[PDB]
Structure 1
């Protein structure tokens, strides 16, 4: 029973972004959007945009959500205290437009 690999763990996490109940759960925790670690991780996960990494993406709306979440990251500013400013209204956006986004991607499914 092998140990997990970085490719497989990062693939599962990047694909979980299609589940936007899951990113609602992630972005309703105060220690995640405030941390610049998550900002830098979501900027790092842009290697799934390009092939051969993009071939393994089974749920490409995760890539859509990844680009949408990284749209706020260049407008993010980290301060000396570690508070990632400009990110207080992102959970507002996610909780307001979550049902709408998943309804639109279900319509794209149909």
Structure 2
């Protein structure tokens, strides 16, 4: 059994954004959105949007979720101490609009 490749782990994590439960689990930790490395990783991951990397994706709503959360990033400025302003209320947006997005994409599935 070889080790899980960077391609495989990054593909499974980028695909996990389709489920809203995973992202609302991730965004409740303060240190995750407080970390600028995770922010850079969020701006690292748009390479899945372009082919042929997009071919292996099974549920493209994860790519939609990736594109959606990036619009909240240019309003965020990281300081010298690492406090990312503007991310204090975006997880609250996620819990308020949580069932809305996933019900909308379930009706799009139908």
TM-score, normalised with respect to structure 2: 0.97
Cα deviation, residue 63, structure 1: 0.3
1:21-63 CA-partner distances (Å, limit 9, x unpaired) = 1000000111111111111101110000000001111110000
Separation (CA, whole Å) in 1 of partners of 2:46 and 2:4: 21
Q: Which runs of 5+ in 1 are unaligned?
A: none
SS at match of 1:21: helix
Deviating 4+ runs (over 4 angstroms): none
Separation (CA, whole Å) in 1 of partners of 2:74 and 2:8: 27
Cα deviation, residue 76, structure 1: 1.2
Q: Which runs of 5+ in 2 are unaligned?
A: none
Separation (CA, whole Å) in 1 of partners of 2:75 and 2:50: 23
Instruction: Give the RMSD, CA atoms, in angstroms.
Output: 0.7
1:45-93 CA-partner distances (Å, limit 9, x unpaired) = 0000000001111110000000011111111100111011111110110
TM-score, normalised with respect to structure 1: 0.97
Aligned pair count?
A: 110
